[PDB]
UniProtKB/Swiss-Prot annotation, chain B:
Source domain of life: Eukaryota
Subunit-level organization: Interacts (secreted) with SLC1A5; mainly at cell surface.
Residues of the full protein shown: 40 to 140 of 160
Coiled coil: none
Designated gene of the protein: ERVH48-1
Note: The human genome contains a high percentage of proviral-like elements, also called endogenous retroviruses (ERVs) that are the genomic traces of ancient infections of the germline by exogenous retroviruses. Although most of these elements are defective, some have conserved a functional envelope (env) gene, most probably diverted by the host for its benefit.
Annotated organism of origin: Homo sapiens
Protein name per its UniProtKB record: Suppressyn
Length: 432, 97, 429, 422
C-alpha cells in the first residue's frame, strides 16, 4: 500500500512528469497525422491557449513578487549592517554573483546552444542610455506596465539619410526599475524607526500571500506545461533540432557550473588569504556529495556547517553567522542557470540581444538574490523575472522546466561550495 | 505595384521630405493597413489615431496625421509586438502564393 | 413636527424622487420651446455635464470598493463554523446567480423592450477566458483584453489576422477573481493575514463612507441627466414607452425568479412547506422594500429567521452575510437586462459569444457590489463600458431606480432566506 | 577648523551653488573653443543625460509623496476642536492662495519675462472641472482628461498622457476626511500612510543630495545648446526679477492689507515682532524646520495663544504655500512665453487652478516647488526643456518663497486669534 501513499505524498512530481510526457506524445502524434501540419494559425492559438493562460498567471504574480520581496529583503539587511564582517560577506556575495553571471552569459554566447539553422536595431550607447533611464522610472504606476525605449525615426533629405531617435514610452512592464525602487525603499524603511517594522510586516504578509498564490499556480501548472510543449512541438519543425538544442543547452549549463565552481571560486580562495584551496575541498568532500544527491540547499546546511567546523578549523562564530544567511542569498548556480537559460531562449527565437539587454540580465539575476529570502530562487520563477525584464516570449519556460530536474543538482552543489569557500576565506581574514 | 505613399511626407520650414518611424504601438492605429513603396522600399501607411498624444494607454506620435511604419519593427526592447509582426509577415508571405 | 419624523426617515429617497420628477419637468419644459436651436450637441453636453461628473465619481469609486470588499469578505467569510455543507451553500449560491442571470437574458431576448420604429464566437470565448486571468493587475485597473481582426494589404488580395489590441475598459472578471483568490490565500495564511484583513476592512469602510457621501450629491446629477436625455430624444413619448417596457421586463424577471425558481429548487424537498415557510417571514421583506439596503436589514433578517422558524444560530451567522454581500442575484439580473436593453436600443449586433460574455460578466460582477441602495448602477456602468457599448441611456436607466432597486434587494433577501432554509434542511438530514 | 564645521553644518547649499557655478563655467568653456554649437541633438542629449536622470527621479517621487502626505494630514486633522473657525481658516487659505496665484500670473503676463522681440474657453473650463473628479484612480496617476475636436467641431475627450494632480489631491483630501470620520477603527491606515510618507521624505532627501550634479549638467547643456547666451541670461534675470517682485509685493501688501481691513491692528508691527523665524526660513528653506522656533517667537511676542497656534500652524505649514503658488505660476507662464505659444483665457484659468491645487498638494521640502512645477507644466501641455533655468536659479527664489509661506501662515494664525477674540 506504500506505493499508493508515495504517489499521494509526491503528487506534484508525478503529475508534472506525466504532463511533460503526455505533451511530447501528443505533439509527436499530431505532427505525424497526415503528411504534415496543415492546421491554421487560429488552431495554433486555440491549441496553445492553456499555455497562454499559464504565462498570464505567472506575469500577474511576477508583479507583486517583485514589488514586495525586494522591499522585504532590503529592509531585512540589518544582520550584515551591524558588523564589518557582515559587510565583507555581503560584498563578497554580490561580487561573486556578478562574476558568475557574467561567466555564464559569456559561455552561453560563445557556445551558441540555439541557432543551428531588414529589421533595424538599436545602438550600443543608446541601449546603455535606455538601460540607465530604466533604472529610475519616470512614474511608479506607469512602470508597472510600461517601459522606456529609444524608437528611431528616419528622414530622407533629398537623398541624405537622417537617423534620429524619439525615445517614447514603449508598452511592456519593466522590472529593473521596479527592483531598484523596491531596493531603495527597503533601505529607506530600514533607516526608519519603529514604524518601519510595521510597514515591513505589511509587506512580508503581502509577499507570503503572493507566495501562496505561486503554490496554487504551480499546482495548476502540469496541464499548461503539457499544452506548451505540444504547441512548441507542432510549431517548431525538425523536432530533432529542438531536442539536440535542449541537450546542448544542458551541456552548456553543466560546463558553466563546472568552470565556475572549479576555477573562479578556487581563484578567489587563492587571492584572498593566499593558500591552497584543494585542502579545504578534500576536507568538505562529504557535504558536496550530500548536496549533489539530495539537491536541497537548506537540508544540507546543518551537516555541512558541522563538517566545516570539525574538519580543518573555523572560528565557528563566523561560520555560525555566515552559513544560515549565505545559504539562501548567494545563489551562484542559480545565476549560471538563469543567464544561460535567458540566452538560450533569446537564441531559440532568433532574437538578437544588444549590450543593454545583457547588462539588464546580469543586474536582475544579481538583484533577485537579495530578494531570494521570500521567493524560490534557482527555479523558473527568477527566469520568468529575467525574461519579462528583457522582453522575450516565455513559451520555452516549460521546455526548460523539462530539464530542470537534471540541471538542478550541480546548481545546489556549486552554491554550497561557494558558501563554504566564502566562509573559509572570511574566517581566515578575520583571524589575521 | 503598391501606390506611392505621398501622405508619409512631412513639410519642414517648405521643403518636403519622406519620413517614417520604426516602432509604433499597436493601439495607435486601427485596422485598414496599406502597403506603399518609396524608391523601391516597401512600408506600411495608416491613419494616425493618436493625434491627441495617446490611445488605450499607449503613447503615440503627436501632431501627425498619417503614420508610416517599416514592415518589421526594431529589436530594441520592443517587447513582443515585434514577434507578432514576425508571425503576421510570415503568414502573409505564405498566403501570398 | 408630526410629519418631521416621516421626512427624516426617508429624506434621501424623497429627495431622489423629487429630483427625478423635477428633471422630467425640466426636460419637458426645455423641449416645449424652440429647442431645435438648443438641440446642438455642445448644449446637450452642457446640460449633461453634472451627470457626467456624477458618473465619473461612480467610476472612480468602483475599484477600491470592489477589490477591498471582496478581499475582506473572502478572507473573512470563508472560515465560518461549518464544514462540507458550506461548499454546498456556496455552490447553490453560484448556481442560483447563474440561473437568475440566464433567466434575465432569456426574458430580455423574449420581451425586446428596446423597440424604436462582429467578433467570432470562439474568439469571444477566448477573450472572456483571458479577461478572467489578467496579465497585469495594475494594467487591469483601466483596460481589458479584446481581439480585433486586421486587413493588412500585401500587393493584392485581402487577408484577416487577429492581433488582440487590449482596448481600454475595465476587466471586472480579473479583479474580482484576483480579490477572491487573494482573500482565500489570506485566510490560509495566518495572523499577519489577519492584520492585512483589518487593513483591507478599514479601507473598505472608508470607501463605504465616501460612497454614502457621493449618494448625497447624486440627485442633482440624476436630474440634469434626465433633463438632458429627455431633450435629446426626438419625442418624449417614444422614450417613456421604452422605459415602461424595460421596467416591465425587469419586474417580470424578478417576480418569475423569486416565485418559481426557488420553489422549484425545493421541488421534492417539500418537508418544509415552501409558501408557508416564506410566509413565516414578512418583516424583513417589508423592511427591505421600505429602505433599499441589504446590509441595513441584516440584523432584523437574522433575528426573524432565527426566532420565527427552525434554523441554527451557527449556520445563520455564517450564511446571512454571504447573501448580504456576495449573493446579489437581483442586482445581477437587473444589470444584465439593463445591459441587453442598452445593446438592443443602440442597434448593435447580438450573437452567442458576446451574450455569453455578458452573462458571465453580469453573474460575476454583481458579487463585487455592496449593500448601498443605489449600488447597481455603478457595476452596470462598468459592465456596459467593458462590453464595448456606448454610454447613451445610462442616464434614464439610472433615473428608473426607485422601484427596480427595491425589487432587487427584496429578491436578494428572499434568496438568502431560501439558501439558509436549504442548508438547515440539509444539515439535520 | 571652524570653517570645516561651518561647511559641515550646511554642505548641501554650498554644494548646489558650486554645482551651478561649475555648470555655467563648463558650459561657457565648452561653447567657447570646444566645438561650439556644432554638437548635434543626439550629442546634446548625451551631454544632458545626468540631468534627465535627475528630472526622472524627481518625477518618480511626487505621486506617493502627495497621495500619502495629504491623506495623513487630513486624517490627523481635527476641525471639531474649534467649531466654526476651521471653516474660516480653510476659506482664508483658499482665497489667499488664489489671490497669490492670480498675482503671480498677472505680473508674469505684464512684465513679459523671456519674451524675445488651441482649446476654447468653455471647453477648457469644462475639462478643468471634469479633471477634479477622476474616472479611475490608477489611470489618474499618469493620464488626465482633455478635449479634442473631430467631425461645427464637436468636442470629444481623449484622456491624454500626464499626471492628474487635481484629482489626486482632491481624492486624498476627501479620503483623509473620511478616515477621520471613520473613528477608532481606522487608526492603522493612518499610521501606515504616515510611515510610507516618512519613507518617501527620506527618499526625497537622498534625491536632493544627488541633485547638484544633475543641476550642473542641465545648466551646462542648456547654456551650450543656445547660440546667444546674452538672451538666456537676460531672460533668467527677467524671471528672477518678476518672481521676486511678485511674491515680495504679495507678502508686503496683500497680507498686510487684508489684516488691516479685518482687525486694523498694525500688521507691520505683527511682522516686526517676528524677526528671527523669518531669518530662519531665509537660511534654510525647509518650512517644517522653522515650525518650533516660530512657535516660540509667536507665543512670546503675541497673544495668539497656544490652542489656536497648534490648531492652525501645522496645517498652515503644509497646505498654505501661497509663495509656492506664485513661483509655480510665474515659472510656467515664463516657460510658455519662452516657447512663443499664445495664451488664452481658458488655459490661464486652468493653469491658475491647477497651480493652486498642486501648491496645496506640495510639501515642506527644502526644494519642493520644482517637482510640482514639472507636474503642472506637463498637465496643461508644454515642452519640458526650460526647467534647467528654473532649477539652476531655484535657490534665491526658494528661500524667498519659504519666507513667504511662513509669514502667510503666521498672518493666518494672528487673524484666526483675533476672530476668536470677538
Amino acid at each position: 500500500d506504500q506505493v499508493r501513499r508515495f504517489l499521494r505524498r509526491n503528487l506534484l512530481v508525478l503529475l508534472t512528469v506525466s504532463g511533460v510526457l503526455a505533451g511530447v506524445a501528443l505533439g509527436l502524434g499530431v505532427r505525424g497525422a497526415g503528411g504534415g501540419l496543415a492546421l491554421s494559425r487560429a488552431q495554433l492559438t486555440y491549441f496553445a491557449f492553456p499555455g497562454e493562460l499559464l504565462l498570464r498567471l505567472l506575469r500577474m504574480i511576477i508583479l507583486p513578487l517583485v514589488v514586495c520581496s525586494l522591499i522585504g529583503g532590503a529592509a531585512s539587511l540589518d544582520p550584515g549592517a551591524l558588523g564589518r564582517l557582515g559587510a565583507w560577506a555581503l560584498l563578497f556575495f554580490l561580487v561573486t554573483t556578478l562574476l558568475a553571471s557574467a561567466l555564464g552569459v559569456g559561455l552561453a554566447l560563445a557556445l551558441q546552444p540555439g541557432a543551428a539553422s531588414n529589421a533595424p536595431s538599436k545602438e550600443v550607447l543608446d541601449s546603455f542610455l535606455d538601460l540607465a533611464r530604466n533604472i529610475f522610472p519616470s512614474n511608479l504606476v506607469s512602470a508597472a506596465f510600461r517601459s522606456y525605449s529609444t524608437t528611431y525615426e528616419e528622414r530622407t533629405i533629398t537623398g541624405t539619410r537622417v537617423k534620429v531617435p524619439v525615445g517614447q514610452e514603449v508598452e511592456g512592464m519593466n522590472i529593473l526599475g521596479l527592483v531598484v525602487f523596491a531596493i531603495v525603499f527597503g533601505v529607506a524603511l530600514r533607516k526608519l524607526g519603529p514604524e518601519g517594522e510595521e510597514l515591513i510586516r505589511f509587506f512580508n504578509s503581502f509577499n507570503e500571500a503572493t507566495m501562496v498564490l505561486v503554490s496554487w499556480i504551480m499546482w495548476y501548472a502540469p496541464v499548461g506545461i503539457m499544452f506548451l510543449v505540444a504547441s512548441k512541438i507542432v510549431e517548431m519543425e525538425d523536432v530533432v533540432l529542438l531536442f539536440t538544442s535542449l541537450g546542448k543547452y544542458i551541456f552548456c549549463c553543466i560546463l558553466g557550473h563546472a568552470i565556475h565552481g572549479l576555477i573562479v571560486l578556487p581563484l578567489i580562495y587563492f587571492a584572498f588569504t593566499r593558500k591552497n584551496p584543494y585542502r579545504f575541498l578534500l576536507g568538505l568532500l562529504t557535504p558536496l556529495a550530500t548536496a549533489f544527491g539530495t539537491s536541497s540547499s537548506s537540508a544540507t546546511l546543518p551537516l555541512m556547517m558541522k563538517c566545516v567546523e570539525e574538519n580543518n578549523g573555523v572560528d565557528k562564530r563566523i561560520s555560525r553567522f555566515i552559513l544560515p544567511i549565505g545559504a539562501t542569498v548567494n545563489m551562484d548556480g542559480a545565476a549560471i542557470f538563469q543567464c544561460v537559460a535567458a540566452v538560450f531562449i533569446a537564441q531559440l527565437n532568433n532574437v538578437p540581444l544588444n549590450f543593454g539587454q545583457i547588462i539588464t540580465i546580469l543586474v536582475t539575476a544579481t538583484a533577485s538574490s537579495v530578494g531570494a529570502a521570500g521567493i524560490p530562487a534557482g527555479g523558473v520563477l527568477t527566469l520568468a523575472i529575467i525574461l519579462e525584464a528583457i522582453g522575450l516570449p516565455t513559451h520555452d519556460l516549460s521546455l526548460i522546466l523539462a530539464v530542470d530536474w537534471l540541471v538542478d543538482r550541480t546548481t545546489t552543489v556549486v552554491n554550497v561550495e561557494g558558501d563554504a569557500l566564502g566562509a573559509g576565506i572570511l574566517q581566515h581574514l578575520n583571524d589575521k | 505595384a503598391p501606390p506611392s505613399c505621398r501622405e508619409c511626407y512631412q513639410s519642414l520650414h517648405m521643403q518636403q521630405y519622406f519620413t517614417y518611424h520604426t516602432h509604433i504601438e499597436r493601439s495607435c492605429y486601427g485596422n485598414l493597413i496599406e502597403e506603399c513603396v518609396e524608391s523601391g522600399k516597401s512600408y506600411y501607411k495608416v491613419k494616425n489615431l493618436g493625434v491627441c498624444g495617446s490611445r488605450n494607454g499607449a503613447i503615440c506620435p503627436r501632431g501627425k496625421q498619417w503614420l508610416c511604419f517599416t514592415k518589421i519593427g526594431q529589436w530594441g526592447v520592443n517587447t513582443q509586438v515585434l514577434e507578432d509582426i514576425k508571425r503576421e509577415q510570415i503568414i502573409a508571405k505564405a498566403k501570398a502564393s
